[PDB]
Scaffold this active site. Structure first.
Site, PDB file in Angstrom:
ATOM      1  N   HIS A 147       0.853  -1.225   0.000  1.00 50.88           N
ATOM      2  CA  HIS A 147       0.000   0.000   0.000  1.00 50.88           C
ATOM      3  C   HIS A 147       0.876   1.258   0.000  1.00 50.88           C
ATOM      4  O   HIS A 147       0.777   2.087   0.932  1.00 50.88           O
ATOM      5  CB  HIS A 147      -1.007  -0.019   1.155  1.00 50.88           C
ATOM      6  CG  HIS A 147      -2.154  -0.935   0.902  1.00 50.88           C
ATOM      7  ND1 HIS A 147      -2.211  -2.214   1.424  1.00 50.88           N
ATOM      8  CD2 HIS A 147      -3.276  -0.763   0.180  1.00 50.88           C
ATOM      9  CE1 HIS A 147      -3.328  -2.786   1.036  1.00 50.88           C
ATOM     10  NE2 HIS A 147      -3.999  -1.917   0.271  1.00 50.88           N
ATOM     11  N   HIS A 152       1.758   1.653  -5.676  1.00 52.87           N
ATOM     12  CA  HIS A 152       0.334   1.246  -5.738  1.00 52.87           C
ATOM     13  C   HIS A 152      -0.500   2.466  -6.163  1.00 52.87           C
ATOM     14  O   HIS A 152      -1.374   2.325  -7.018  1.00 52.87           O
ATOM     15  CB  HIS A 152      -0.109   0.647  -4.393  1.00 52.87           C
ATOM     16  CG  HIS A 152      -1.566   0.350  -4.329  1.00 52.87           C
ATOM     17  ND1 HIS A 152      -2.164  -0.547  -5.182  1.00 52.87           N
ATOM     18  CD2 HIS A 152      -2.549   0.852  -3.553  1.00 52.87           C
ATOM     19  CE1 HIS A 152      -3.454  -0.603  -4.917  1.00 52.87           C
ATOM     20  NE2 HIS A 152      -3.718   0.254  -3.927  1.00 52.87           N
ATOM     21  N   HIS A 159      -5.891   7.718  -3.092  1.00 53.86           N
ATOM     22  CA  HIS A 159      -6.887   6.774  -2.507  1.00 53.86           C
ATOM     23  C   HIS A 159      -6.333   6.082  -1.253  1.00 53.86           C
ATOM     24  O   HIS A 159      -7.133   5.827  -0.349  1.00 53.86           O
ATOM     25  CB  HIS A 159      -7.407   5.789  -3.563  1.00 53.86           C
ATOM     26  CG  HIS A 159      -6.615   4.534  -3.717  1.00 53.86           C
ATOM     27  ND1 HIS A 159      -5.398   4.505  -4.373  1.00 53.86           N
ATOM     28  CD2 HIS A 159      -6.885   3.262  -3.340  1.00 53.86           C
ATOM     29  CE1 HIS A 159      -4.925   3.271  -4.356  1.00 53.86           C
ATOM     30  NE2 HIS A 159      -5.828   2.484  -3.730  1.00 53.86           N
ATOM     31  N   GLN A 172      -6.305 -17.574  -3.494  1.00 53.76           N
ATOM     32  CA  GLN A 172      -6.332 -16.689  -4.699  1.00 53.76           C
ATOM     33  C   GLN A 172      -7.452 -17.093  -5.677  1.00 53.76           C
ATOM     34  O   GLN A 172      -8.049 -16.171  -6.289  1.00 53.76           O
ATOM     35  CB  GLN A 172      -4.983 -16.734  -5.420  1.00 53.76           C
ATOM     36  CG  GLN A 172      -3.869 -16.031  -4.661  1.00 53.76           C
ATOM     37  CD  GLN A 172      -4.094 -14.542  -4.662  1.00 53.76           C
ATOM     38  OE1 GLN A 172      -4.102 -13.893  -5.713  1.00 53.76           O
ATOM     39  NE2 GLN A 172      -4.303 -13.993  -3.476  1.00 53.76           N
TER      40      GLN A 172
END
Ligand SMILES: Cc1ccc(C)c(C(=O)Nc2ccn3cc(-c4ccccc4)nc3n2)n1
Ligand SMILES: [Mg+2]
Ligand SMILES: [Zn+2]
EC number: 3.1.4.17
Length: 313
Positions: free
Chosen positions: A68, A72, A106, A269
């Protein structure tokens, strides 16, 4: 005004594609972003001295966490650039302005921990914001930097236009709360199928922008397999560190966050592709057909995960 940004020829070409990787040279990302704003929005949208100062302040307030992070932020902004440049006439001047700034901002000041862990840790941000805890924080950091002197990149918008664009950026950032995706997509799935979807309905646009934001946020699953495979190591690096802190609280974490349960990763996944990724890109293609490449790339990677379980790699 006449100072255009220009990328080398491999990037200039590949940057238009959905699966583009922004590469390992950190120092090129700010110029990559600006190039995209200029081509997506126009050379007039922002004051180049203001934009650059905004950008480097945003970079500064991302942390050194495995996933993060600043890469990103620019990666999610590029996916939104691909979507806007394949849907040239559907979005307004303000939406194209706000959404690339929304995407870069974001995950501002992310620690590498889910809303759940903040709640269970009893973090002060949990007390101040009871739902979408980090996403309300991310938007708060974005308003904070927008207000820093010389950083108001929207200073030529009217009072009302400035509020519209900040409201676009708010809804945009809240939508990256995956806990809000499930119901948003289900609602869009119905509205499309019953054929009541209407892009001139402002509540309908908000939903569609919300899905774009999930799409762009998850765009790791839409890259070529070697990029997808390697990004997953960073995502799980954060998840396992969160599990470690859950164990430290006296709480067995879910297997997704338990580093003693690496063997189950491939299956986990599959769950995620089937439960979240494919439904997301299916519904987005239905509403925005030129985003079919994300769906295709996602399915390719799904197949690659099946192959891993089967011991073919
Ligand atoms: C590539 C990408 C991008 C964004 C997200 C949010 C995820 C993501 O959510 N991945 C997930 C979900 C659920 N999972 C469950 C497991 C599991 C592991 C080991 C044993 C049991 C279960 N792994 C998971 N991984 N993955
Ligand atoms: Mg987030
Ligand atoms: Zn994100």
């Amino acid at each position: 005004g006449l100072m255009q940004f220009t990328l080398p020829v491999r990037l200039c070409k590949e940057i238009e594609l959905f699966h583009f990787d922004i590469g390992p040279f950190e120092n090129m990302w700010p110029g990559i972003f600006v190039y995209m704003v200029h081509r997506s929005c126009g050379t007039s949208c922002f004051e180049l001295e203001k934009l650059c100062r905004f950008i480097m302040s945003v970079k500064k307030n991302y942390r050194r966490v495995p996933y993060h992070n600043w890469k990103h932020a620019v990666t999610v902004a590029h996916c939104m650039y691909a979507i806007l440049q394949n849907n040239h006439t559907l979005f307004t001047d303000l939406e194209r302005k706000g959404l690339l700034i929304a995407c870069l901002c974001h995950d501002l000041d992310h620690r590498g921990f889910s809303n759940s862990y903040l709640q269970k840790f009893d973090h002060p941000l949990a007390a101040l914001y009871s739902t979408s805890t980090m996403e309300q924080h991310h938007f708060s950091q974005t308003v904070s930097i927008l207000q820093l002197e010389g950083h108001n990149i929207f200073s030529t918008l009217s009072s009302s236009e400035y509020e519209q664009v900040l409201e676009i950026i708010r809804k945009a950032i809240i939508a990256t709360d995956l806990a809000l995706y499930f119901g948003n997509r289900k609602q869009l799935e119905e509205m499309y199928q019953t054929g009541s979807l209407n892009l001139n309905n402002q509540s309908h646009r908000d939903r569609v922008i919300g899905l774009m934001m999930t799409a762009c946020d998850l765009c790791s699953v839409t890259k070529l397999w070697p990029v997808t495979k390697l990004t997953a190591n960073d995502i799980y690096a954060e998840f396992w560190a969160e599990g470690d802190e859950m164990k430290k609280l006296g709480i067995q974490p879910i297997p997704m966050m338990d580093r003693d349960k690496k063997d189950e990763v491939p299956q986990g996944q599959l769950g995620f592709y089937n439960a979240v990724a494919i439904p997301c890109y299916t519904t987005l293609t239905q509403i925005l057909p030129p985003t079919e490449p994300l769906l295709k790339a996602c399915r390719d990677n799904l197949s690659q995960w099946e192959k891993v379980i089967r011991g073919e790699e």
